[PDB]
Amino acid sequence: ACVFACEDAAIIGLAV
Amino acid sequence: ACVFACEDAAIIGLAV
Amino acid sequence: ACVFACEDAAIIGLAV
Amino acid sequence: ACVFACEDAAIIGLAV
């Protein structure tokens, strides 16, 4: 998968 | 939203 | 093109 | 840049 820097405010790494 | 790294040149971050 | 961070395990930058 | 098809509901092409 890929990792993107997304929000949650709070920016983290998210694996998709 | 997420931050992507794309060239428009120059490579930059772009929210989505 | 955009740079993705994806799994190939090794995680590499992908020129898309 | 890449063209994404995302929801804004309306679905539009996004120039990223």
Add this chain to the structure above:
Amino acid sequence: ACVFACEDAAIIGLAV
């Protein structure tokens, strides 16, 4: 969200 044309062989639309 966004819709991408991904595999499943069998190519369909996938909402992310």
Add this chain to the structure above:
Amino acid sequence: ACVFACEDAAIIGLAV
């Protein structure tokens, strides 16, 4: 994998 639409120019499909 997924097909993305990006310009490299010319806009083309690219597997990932």
